[PDB]
Each structure stands twice: as C-alpha cells, then as structure tokens.
Design a protein around this ligand. Structure first.
Ligand SMILES: Cc1cc2nc3c(=O)[nH]c(=O)nc-3n(C[C@H](O)[C@H](O)[C@H](O)COP(=O)(O)O)c2cc1C
Ligand SMILES: Cc1cc2nc3c(=O)[nH]c(=O)nc-3n(C[C@H](O)[C@H](O)[C@H](O)COP(=O)(O)O)c2cc1C
Lengths: 189, 189
C-alpha cells in the first residue's frame, strides 16, 4: 500500500533543548493524586485527551485499545463497590472512585499489552498537560466483572482504571523522590 | 511515610481546551519513521527525554526501568546484526539501526511491564515534542543476547528498542489513518 513524504518540522538545537527541558519540568510535576474533586471536567478536554492517547503506535497498526468513560454516579458506585470488595482480601477504601466526575477504564483488545500501555502513558501525559489529575490503577481480576458491568465484548481485557478530575483542596501526595538520571540511564560511548 | 500538600495548577477551562487541542495536534503528527539521518543529537536533549520518561508512575514506586543509550557505531552494528539474524526466520533489512546516531534500549527490571511501557509512552511523547523521530520496536526474542551483549544483569528483560534521530530527506511513511474518536471511545452517561 501507498507511501508518502514525511513532514520535516525542524527546530534549531537550542529550541529542542528549551522544549525538552520545559516538557520534563511539566511532566515531573505529575503525581498520583488520591483526592479528587467532584467538579465536572469539560467533555471536550476529555475527548482531546483520549484522541491524544489514540495517536500512539501499535504493533502492526491494530490500535487495539478501548477507552471507556464513566460519568454515571450509579455505575461509578457499582464500579467502586466492586473494586473495594476484591481489595478487602488479606487503606482498602477508595473514595475517589465516587468523587471523581469521570472514570476512564482502558481495555485491551485481543504485542497489544505493550501497545495499550504505551497509549495509557500518552494519556497520562495528556492529563498532566491539560492540568487534570488521576491515580493510575490496574485492577486486574476485577476485569471480568467490570467488563460485564460495562457491556464489553469479552475479547477486551481491562488494563487500567483512571479516576479523572481536579484535585480537591485537601489533596496530599506522599513525599517521594524520583531517581536521578544516573540511576535510570546507561550510556555506551 | 510522610505526606505533603499537592500544589494545584490554575489553568482556566478555555486554557485547558486550547492546551489539550495543541497537544493532540502535536502528538497526532508522530509517525514511526523508518528512515533516519546519521546526524548527532545533542546529548542534553537525550538526557531530557529520558528524564521525562523517568517521571512515569510505577506500581509501588519501584521505578523498574533502565534506559540504555548506545552511541557506539561498532556495538550498534553488532546490535543490528543480531536483530536481523533472528527476524530472518520464516523488509528483512533494518538499516536505520546503523544510520540512527543513537539507539535507546529500554529494560524492565524484574506490574513492571505496564509500568515500563507507560514510561516508554511518555518517552515517545517526549521525542515527538523535541522534534526527534523513531520507530518503536519490541524484539523480545533476541533480548537475552542483547542483555548479555550490553552487559546488563539477568533481572533486566529487554522491552523496547528505539532508534533515534532526525528523519532523512527521503523519509516516507506509509499512508495510514488513525481511528476517529468514536472508534476508540465509549461514554456511558
Ligand atoms: C501499573 C500501576 C499500577 C498502580 N496501582 C496503584 C494502585 O492500585 N493504587 C494506588 O494508590 N496507586 C497505584 N499506582 C500509582 C503508584 O502508586 C504511583 O505512581 C507511585 O507510587 C509513584 O507516585 P507518583 O505517580 O505520584 O509519582 C499504580 C501505578 C502503576 C504504574
Ligand atoms: C509493540 C510494538 C512493536 C512494533 N514493532 C515494529 C517492528 O518490529 N517494526 C516496525 O517497522 N514497526 C514496529 N512498530 C511500529 C508500528 O508498525 C507503527 O507504530 C504502526 O504501524 C502505526 O504507525 P505510526 O507509528 O506511524 O502511527 C511497533 C509498534 C509497537 C507498539
């Protein structure tokens, strides 16, 4: 099938530095926030963020992802109680599943797992950039119940669940440091 | 242990819309580019996108990733030779492994896989934002040969290989469209 010229779009050296630095600083401020307002997020913003995620690479171009957005208080609650019950197995309370205006549940269609996670990574970058917060959760083993609850095809496995909204006034984050560059990076020169 | 106040943004809605749009347009221009110049990339810029990737969330804050950056022509060729040999099994040439100034090999240290793939997603966003190109590859079959070649511990499994640089003048991309939003998104209201 057909092949077309690729658009250059060339930044000068110092522009790339400035741009890559700013993006690091923007994303370095991302934190998983477990305290989330019930304020509504504009659907446009949610659309744009999911579009952005959909621009991810995928193995053999399958785009094997489904982003399920839950705005309904009742199913959000059912989702909440389902998640809590399983986590009670030997704190266990997740309130933000209710308080967040939106739950985004990412499903993988059946190297798709990697492809879908790559997209989720892009989604999180998109949330940060848009000034929204979430906390990444991967409630596997709850997938079958949630897939059924949400009416999904069964060749879909749940991958990730992101409560999405604005941080509430009392929001805190634990005090954690990220590894320095030298503990994530090896260069062979 | 200790907890700190999370400091919010202030982006007003109209700003969030515009920002989310701009970011979608930026990332929508990302294509896997199989034709890559041998022009050196500024090392600072490479540092910044790896730093950015290291800002990813990880399960239990383990930050279980290692980004190996190969700038040495000999070992990059050795890398090319290994990769081509295996995929020859029943096009076959990946020349860009030689021509690209830099190869980035991401290892999972053993939900580590999802965590590392999330970071890789953020890495791709960062490359795009910096005006660099790549093609995502996941040669897990020859991963142990490369782990040994690259002198990494046995508890690191290879995940992804990104050749990284500027696109060639002759660089094309196949002509593909992404799914429209309504093929990736379901909203239950
Ligand atoms: C695959 C994955 C699963 C996660 N699951 C949970 C979870 O069940 N509960 C939770 O509170 N955080 C979860 N997190 C978030 C991590 O706890 C958080 O990212 C990490 O502690 C670092 O904090 P930060 O994201 O604010 O930088 C998960 C993160 C990843 C990548
Ligand atoms: C897990 C994974 C593995 C991939 N492996 C290859 C590969 O071996 N060779 C290749 O040319 N592209 C590979 N790709 C790139 C995809 O072919 C490419 O992303 C997809 O066709 C969509 O095109 P785009 O990235 O330009 O939007 C891979 C992508 C993913 C997510």
């Amino acid at each position: 099938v057909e092949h077309i010229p690729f658009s250059h779009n060339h930044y000068p050296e110092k522009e790339m530095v400035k741009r890559s630095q700013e993006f690091y600083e923007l994303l370095n401020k991302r934190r998983s926030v477990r305290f989330i307002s019930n304020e509504q997020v504009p659907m446009e913003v949610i659309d744009n963020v999911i579009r952005t995620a959909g621009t991810a690479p995928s193995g053999a171009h399958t785009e094997p992802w489904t982003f399920v957005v839950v705005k309904d208080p009742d199913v959000k609650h059912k989702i909440r109680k389902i998640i809590e019950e399983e986590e009670e197995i030997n704190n266990w309370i997740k309130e933000y599943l209710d308080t967040a205006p939106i739950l985004i549940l990412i499903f993988k269609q059946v190297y798709n797992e990697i492809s879908v996670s790559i997209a989720c990574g892009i989604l999180l970058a998109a949330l940060q950039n848009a000034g929204l917060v979430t906390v990444t959760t991967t409630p596997l083993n709850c997938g079958p119940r949630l897939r059924v609850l949400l009416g999904r095809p069964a060749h879909e496995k749940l991958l990730m669940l992101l409560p999405v909204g604005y941080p509430s006034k009392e929001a805190t984050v634990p005090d954690l440091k990220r590894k320095p560059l030298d503990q994530i990076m090896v260069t062979v020169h």
